[PDB]
Amino acid sequence: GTSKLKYVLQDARFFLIKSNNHENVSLAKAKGVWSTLPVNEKKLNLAFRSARSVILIFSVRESGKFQGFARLSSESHHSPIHWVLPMSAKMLGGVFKIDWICRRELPFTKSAHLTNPWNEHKPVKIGRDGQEIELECGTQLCLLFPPDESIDLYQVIHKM
Numbered sequence: 001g002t003s004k005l006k007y008v009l010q011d012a013r014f015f016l017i018k019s020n021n022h023e024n025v026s027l028a029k030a031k032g033v034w035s036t037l038p039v040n041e042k043k044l045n046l047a048f049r050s051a052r053s054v055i056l057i058f059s060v061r062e063s064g065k066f067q068g069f070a071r072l073s074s075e076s077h078h079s080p081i082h083w084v085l086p087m088s089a090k091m092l093g094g095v096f097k098i099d100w101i102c103r104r105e106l107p108f109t110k111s112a113h114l115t116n117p118w119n120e121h122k123p124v125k126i127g128r129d130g131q132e133i134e135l136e137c138g139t140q141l142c143l144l145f146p147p148d149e150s151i152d153l154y155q156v157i158h159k160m
């Protein structure tokens, strides 16, 4: 069903995360963590205190797809992570813990009807790493992903 998913997304905030390689998204999926540059780290920490759920929607650059979405379970904090960088390791910030809500892909062709008011109404696939996605656009984007039957949102609801 979709009822628990809709509950988790209620009054949520949404951020587009752009990764330059698949390896970092796979590590995030395996370990339940993300790290970003300080300008985005500060924004995500502010958002985490501001909203019931903060949702990161991941896209690997040049893939033409989103790779899934996840909810922040903590602010950033400073084991290490063997990220693959394009940079010099210590240019990144702290580590955010995340709970995956969907690990399945969604092609950009399926989100062509979604525009983001916070990025000049460009298609939601367009945005810098860290671009906030307005509530209605972000909710509809998350609802487009294929259902991920491996995930149980019961534990995620209790963290709200």
Ligand SMILES: CNC(=O)c1ccc2[nH]c(C)c(C)c2c1
Pocket (backbone or CB within 6 Å): 024, 034, 035, 036, 037, 083, 084, 085, 086, 087, 092, 129
């Ligand atoms: C120009 N931005 C970057 O190179 C960049 C930004 C955010 C990032 N998060 C992680 C895990 C990496 C490797 C990374 C690189």
